[PDB]
Design a protein around this ligand. Sequence first.
Ligand SMILES: c1cnc(Oc2ccc(-c3cc[nH]n3)cc2)nc1
Ligand SMILES: c1cnc(Oc2ccc(-c3cc[nH]n3)cc2)nc1
Length: 211
Amino acid sequence: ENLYFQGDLIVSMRILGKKRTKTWHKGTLIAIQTVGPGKKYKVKFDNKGKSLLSGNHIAYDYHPPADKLYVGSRVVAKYKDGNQVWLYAGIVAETPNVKNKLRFLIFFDDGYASYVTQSELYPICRPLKKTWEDIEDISCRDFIEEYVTAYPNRPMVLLKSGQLIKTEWEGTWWKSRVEEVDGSLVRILFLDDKRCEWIYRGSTRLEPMFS
Ligand SMILES: c1cnc(Oc2ccc(-c3cc[nH]n3)cc2)nc1
Ligand SMILES: c1cnc(Oc2ccc(-c3cc[nH]n3)cc2)nc1
């Protein structure tokens, strides 16, 4: 059947939709379709290209209030790519507290982690029951499932600037050094390449967590 209303969604609403590039973009909800128990959402992007999307692949174009966000909430967030910024899907790992200077910790679908503000987040419209089950990468999906279900039990390595450790990259161990700590994240310098990466302190990419 063709609907005009479905829960709190209304045909003609402005919304965000997931493109095949896996980045999210502004569009208009132009149709809502049912096939038995299933729903699909037709989005016209602001370039006139159109997609028929599942409800876990559309997001509201507004910033969610803090009492609506939990550990495990499915969101779209501002993602830093060199000198460019995109909107990319993730999971809420931490809500604002004194130890994280009142920020949200996001685990992105590709395994990147970063702290963001409330003005950098958007809520996905119809998340799955198990919110991690639409993460495509098996290693990221399994890690997120274990993290969200074990919370608040969170094993982490206590690290200090200057400490020498081994860090995983492309399947092998690399000589590295702790450059900085920010809450649950550590900035690692890869010593041979002389470039840095922010990594979650409970990641198995840090040799002390692997062991
Ligand atoms: C495939 C999986 N999930 C959905 O939507 C659901 C969303 C939430 C729940 C639920 C039940 C108890 N708590 N949350 C169930 C279903 N649709 C397709
Ligand atoms: C926050 C941090 N990490 C993830 O996912 C991953 C975790 C571990 C690996 C990995 C690769 C080789 N060894 N461990 C990859 C991805 N997701 C949220």
